[PDB]
Write an enzyme that holds these catalytic residues in place. Structure first.
Site, PDB file in Angstrom:
ATOM      1  N   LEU A 196     104.099  46.480  -6.334  1.00 24.95           N
ATOM      2  CA  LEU A 196     105.552  46.114  -6.371  1.00 24.95           C
ATOM      3  C   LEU A 196     105.917  45.723  -4.937  1.00 24.95           C
ATOM      4  O   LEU A 196     105.314  46.295  -4.032  1.00 24.95           O
ATOM      5  CB  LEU A 196     106.296  47.336  -6.907  1.00 24.95           C
ATOM      6  CG  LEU A 196     106.029  47.756  -8.339  1.00 24.95           C
ATOM      7  CD1 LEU A 196     106.662  49.098  -8.678  1.00 24.95           C
ATOM      8  CD2 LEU A 196     106.561  46.664  -9.274  1.00 24.95           C
ATOM      9  N   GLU A 231     113.821  54.732 -10.706  1.00 23.67           N
ATOM     10  CA  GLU A 231     113.755  53.413 -11.385  1.00 23.67           C
ATOM     11  C   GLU A 231     112.582  53.553 -12.335  1.00 23.67           C
ATOM     12  O   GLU A 231     112.594  53.206 -13.513  1.00 23.67           O
ATOM     13  CB  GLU A 231     113.769  52.268 -10.423  1.00 23.67           C
ATOM     14  CG  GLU A 231     114.040  50.849 -10.926  1.00 23.67           C
ATOM     15  CD  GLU A 231     113.132  50.372 -12.040  1.00 23.67           C
ATOM     16  OE1 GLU A 231     111.917  50.342 -11.716  1.00 23.67           O
ATOM     17  OE2 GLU A 231     113.516  50.033 -13.136  1.00 23.67           O
TER      18      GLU A 231
HETATM   19  N1  LIG Z   1     108.735  44.539 -10.868  1.00 20.06           N
HETATM   20  C1  LIG Z   1     108.270  44.575 -12.343  1.00 20.06           C
HETATM   21  O1  LIG Z   1     109.089  44.828 -12.993  1.00 20.06           O
HETATM   22  C2  LIG Z   1     106.798  44.234 -12.656  1.00 20.06           C
HETATM   23  C3  LIG Z   1     106.029  43.918 -11.498  1.00 20.06           C
HETATM   24  N2  LIG Z   1     104.641  43.563 -11.790  1.00 20.06           N
HETATM   25  C4  LIG Z   1     103.727  43.164 -10.622  1.00 20.06           C
HETATM   26  O2  LIG Z   1     103.539  41.681 -10.899  1.00 20.06           O
HETATM   27  C5  LIG Z   1     102.084  41.373 -10.625  1.00 20.06           C
HETATM   28  C6  LIG Z   1     101.275  41.282 -11.970  1.00 20.06           C
HETATM   29  O3  LIG Z   1     101.562  39.879 -12.248  1.00 20.06           O
HETATM   30  P1  LIG Z   1     101.282  38.553 -12.981  1.00 20.06           P
HETATM   31  O4  LIG Z   1     100.547  37.775 -11.975  1.00 20.06           O
HETATM   32  O5  LIG Z   1     102.419  37.753 -13.374  1.00 20.06           O
HETATM   33  O6  LIG Z   1     100.106  38.654 -14.121  1.00 20.06           O
HETATM   34  P2  LIG Z   1      99.816  39.152 -15.675  1.00 20.06           P
HETATM   35  O7  LIG Z   1     100.133  40.511 -15.557  1.00 20.06           O
HETATM   36  O8  LIG Z   1     100.913  38.616 -16.568  1.00 20.06           O
HETATM   37  O9  LIG Z   1      98.422  38.775 -15.745  1.00 20.06           O
HETATM   38  C7  LIG Z   1      97.852  37.360 -15.757  1.00 20.06           C
HETATM   39  C8  LIG Z   1      96.688  37.273 -16.798  1.00 20.06           C
HETATM   40  O10 LIG Z   1      97.118  37.891 -17.866  1.00 20.06           O
HETATM   41  C9  LIG Z   1      96.623  37.230 -19.132  1.00 20.06           C
HETATM   42  N3  LIG Z   1      97.765  36.651 -19.677  1.00 20.06           N
HETATM   43  C10 LIG Z   1      98.955  36.643 -18.988  1.00 20.06           C
HETATM   44  N4  LIG Z   1      99.901  36.009 -19.740  1.00 20.06           N
HETATM   45  C11 LIG Z   1      99.180  35.682 -20.925  1.00 20.06           C
HETATM   46  C12 LIG Z   1      99.546  34.979 -22.233  1.00 20.06           C
HETATM   47  N5  LIG Z   1     100.876  34.588 -22.318  1.00 20.06           N
HETATM   48  N6  LIG Z   1      98.580  34.815 -23.171  1.00 20.06           N
HETATM   49  C13 LIG Z   1      97.369  35.278 -22.879  1.00 20.06           C
HETATM   50  N7  LIG Z   1      96.933  35.890 -21.789  1.00 20.06           N
HETATM   51  C14 LIG Z   1      97.915  36.054 -20.842  1.00 20.06           C
HETATM   52  C15 LIG Z   1      95.522  36.251 -18.499  1.00 20.06           C
HETATM   53  O11 LIG Z   1      94.288  36.755 -18.388  1.00 20.06           O
HETATM   54  P3  LIG Z   1      93.017  35.683 -18.559  1.00 20.06           P
HETATM   55  O12 LIG Z   1      92.836  34.980 -17.331  1.00 20.06           O
HETATM   56  O13 LIG Z   1      92.381  36.939 -18.391  1.00 20.06           O
HETATM   57  O14 LIG Z   1      93.043  35.094 -19.762  1.00 20.06           O
HETATM   58  C16 LIG Z   1      96.377  35.834 -17.277  1.00 20.06           C
HETATM   59  O15 LIG Z   1      95.507  35.369 -16.098  1.00 20.06           O
HETATM   60  C17 LIG Z   1     101.575  42.654  -9.807  1.00 20.06           C
HETATM   61  O16 LIG Z   1     102.222  42.187  -8.616  1.00 20.06           O
HETATM   62  C18 LIG Z   1     102.337  43.751 -10.567  1.00 20.06           C
HETATM   63  O17 LIG Z   1     102.428  44.837  -9.691  1.00 20.06           O
HETATM   64  C19 LIG Z   1     104.094  43.497 -13.091  1.00 20.06           C
HETATM   65  C20 LIG Z   1     104.872  43.790 -14.169  1.00 20.06           C
HETATM   66  C21 LIG Z   1     106.316  44.203 -14.094  1.00 20.06           C
HETATM   67  C1  LIG Z   2     103.422  54.112 -15.146  1.00 24.16           C
HETATM   68  O1  LIG Z   2     103.752  54.363 -13.744  1.00 24.16           O
HETATM   69  C2  LIG Z   2     103.723  53.139 -13.037  1.00 24.16           C
HETATM   70  C3  LIG Z   2     103.566  53.446 -11.664  1.00 24.16           C
HETATM   71  C4  LIG Z   2     103.477  52.397 -10.730  1.00 24.16           C
HETATM   72  C5  LIG Z   2     103.539  51.085 -11.245  1.00 24.16           C
HETATM   73  O2  LIG Z   2     103.463  50.009 -10.305  1.00 24.16           O
HETATM   74  C6  LIG Z   2     102.227  50.280  -9.509  1.00 24.16           C
HETATM   75  C7  LIG Z   2     103.695  50.806 -12.566  1.00 24.16           C
HETATM   76  C8  LIG Z   2     103.735  49.298 -12.917  1.00 24.16           C
HETATM   77  N1  LIG Z   2     104.664  48.736 -13.701  1.00 24.16           N
HETATM   78  C9  LIG Z   2     104.191  48.390 -15.051  1.00 24.16           C
HETATM   79  C10 LIG Z   2     106.110  48.904 -13.567  1.00 24.16           C
HETATM   80  C11 LIG Z   2     106.890  49.761 -12.714  1.00 24.16           C
HETATM   81  N2  LIG Z   2     108.260  49.771 -12.749  1.00 24.16           N
HETATM   82  C12 LIG Z   2     108.869  48.901 -13.642  1.00 24.16           C
HETATM   83  N3  LIG Z   2     110.327  48.850 -13.728  1.00 24.16           N
HETATM   84  C13 LIG Z   2     110.987  48.084 -14.561  1.00 24.16           C
HETATM   85  N4  LIG Z   2     112.358  48.091 -14.563  1.00 24.16           N
HETATM   86  N5  LIG Z   2     110.201  47.298 -15.338  1.00 24.16           N
HETATM   87  C14 LIG Z   2     108.845  47.211 -15.345  1.00 24.16           C
HETATM   88  N6  LIG Z   2     108.307  46.347 -16.242  1.00 24.16           N
HETATM   89  C15 LIG Z   2     108.140  48.037 -14.494  1.00 24.16           C
HETATM   90  C16 LIG Z   2     106.778  48.064 -14.466  1.00 24.16           C
HETATM   91  C17 LIG Z   2     103.777  51.879 -13.523  1.00 24.16           C
END
Ligand SMILES: NC(=O)C1=CN([C@@H]2O[C@H](COP(=O)(O)OP(=O)(O)OC[C@H]3O[C@@H](n4cnc5c(N)ncnc54)[C@H](OP(=O)(O)O)[C@@H]3O)[C@@H](O)[C@H]2O)C=CC1
Ligand SMILES: COc1ccc(OC)c(CN(C)c2cnc3nc(N)nc(N)c3c2)c1
Length: 186
Positions: A22, A30
């Site tokens: 993150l 959160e």
């Molecule tokens: N602040 C938040 O709320 C969140 C923050 N994060 C952070 O964001 C980053 C993870 O990000 P992100 O790069 O976007 O990647 P994804 O998590 O969405 O992973 C990308 C891979 O996922 C598979 N994939 C993703 N979308 C699809 C689809 N629509 N259909 C099929 N396969 C799919 C593929 O694998 P393949 O190549 O294997 O086919 C693609 O290369 C980290 O920085 C994580 O910590 C992540 C989630 C929530």
């Molecule tokens: C399950 O505990 C964790 C602990 C650390 C993590 O980031 C390393 C995560 C990752 N991760 C999946 C994560 C964390 N906070 C979040 N907050 C909101 N509002 N929405 C999300 N989709 C989300 C996702 C999950």
């Protein structure tokens, strides 16, 4: 199979991640919120399904994998089988909703939560039908390498309030954030 929802925490620059982590220091409440929302089922003997991309799966600390109390599904086109700890693997978002409709899962799942990445959110958001976005606005800028797609205000309505979601500004580690709920039906 109930509701389709997206949950995400985003910075003012619309950032969601940086080098698979993150962009801000960890926020304990959160995170409790995130766990509370995705884990709570509105039906007895039902559990929510959590859908995430391959990178999102790998970004969760291993001890926290799989997310407990939820059915975990990973999205990948390259993976041959679900990663260690994961329950299901789909090659597409549509393939994942379909499976919801298999007698396999059809009786076990309430809500379906999309938890990441950008790729996954962008397609959920274009998916036709009823959809809600639970957005945590982190009220500052954070260097990021991955962003949340722009929200179409002509399609999504910000709700004035939502049961179980605080409406005022929170603060943790000197960082201000607020919770938002957007709804669509097209
Ligand atoms: N602040 C938040 O709320 C969140 C923050 N994060 C952070 O964001 C980053 C993870 O990000 P992100 O790069 O976007 O990647 P994804 O998590 O969405 O992973 C990308 C891979 O996922 C598979 N994939 C993703 N979308 C699809 C689809 N629509 N259909 C099929 N396969 C799919 C593929 O694998 P393949 O190549 O294997 O086919 C693609 O290369 C980290 O920085 C994580 O910590 C992540 C989630 C929530
Ligand atoms: C399950 O505990 C964790 C602990 C650390 C993590 O980031 C390393 C995560 C990752 N991760 C999946 C994560 C964390 N906070 C979040 N907050 C909101 N509002 N929405 C999300 N989709 C989300 C996702 C999950």
């Amino acid at each position: 199979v109930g509701s389709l929802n997206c949950i995400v925490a985003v910075s003012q620059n619309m950032g969601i991640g940086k080098n698979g982590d993150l962009p801000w220091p960890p926020l304990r409440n959160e995170g409790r919120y995130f766990q509370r929302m995705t884990t709570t089922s509105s039906v007895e003997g039902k559990q929510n399904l959590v859908i995430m991309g391959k990178k999102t799966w790998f970004s969760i600390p291993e001890k926290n994998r799989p997310l407990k109390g939820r059915i975990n599904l990973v999205l990948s086109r390259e993976l041959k089988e679900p990663p260690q700890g994961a329950h299901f693997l789909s090659r597409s978002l549509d393939d994942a909703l379909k499976l919801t409709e298999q007698p396999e899962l059809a009786n076990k799942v309430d809500m379906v939560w999309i938890v990441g990445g950008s790729s996954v959110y962008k397609e959920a958001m274009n998916h036709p039908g009823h959809l809600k976005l639970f957005v945590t606005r982190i009220m500052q800028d954070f260097e990021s390498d991955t962003f949340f797609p722009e929200i179409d205000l002509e399609k999504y309505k910000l709700l004035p309030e939502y049961p179980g979601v605080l409406s005022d500004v929170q603060e943790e580690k000197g960082i201000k954030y607020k919770f938002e709920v957007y709804e669509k039906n097209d």
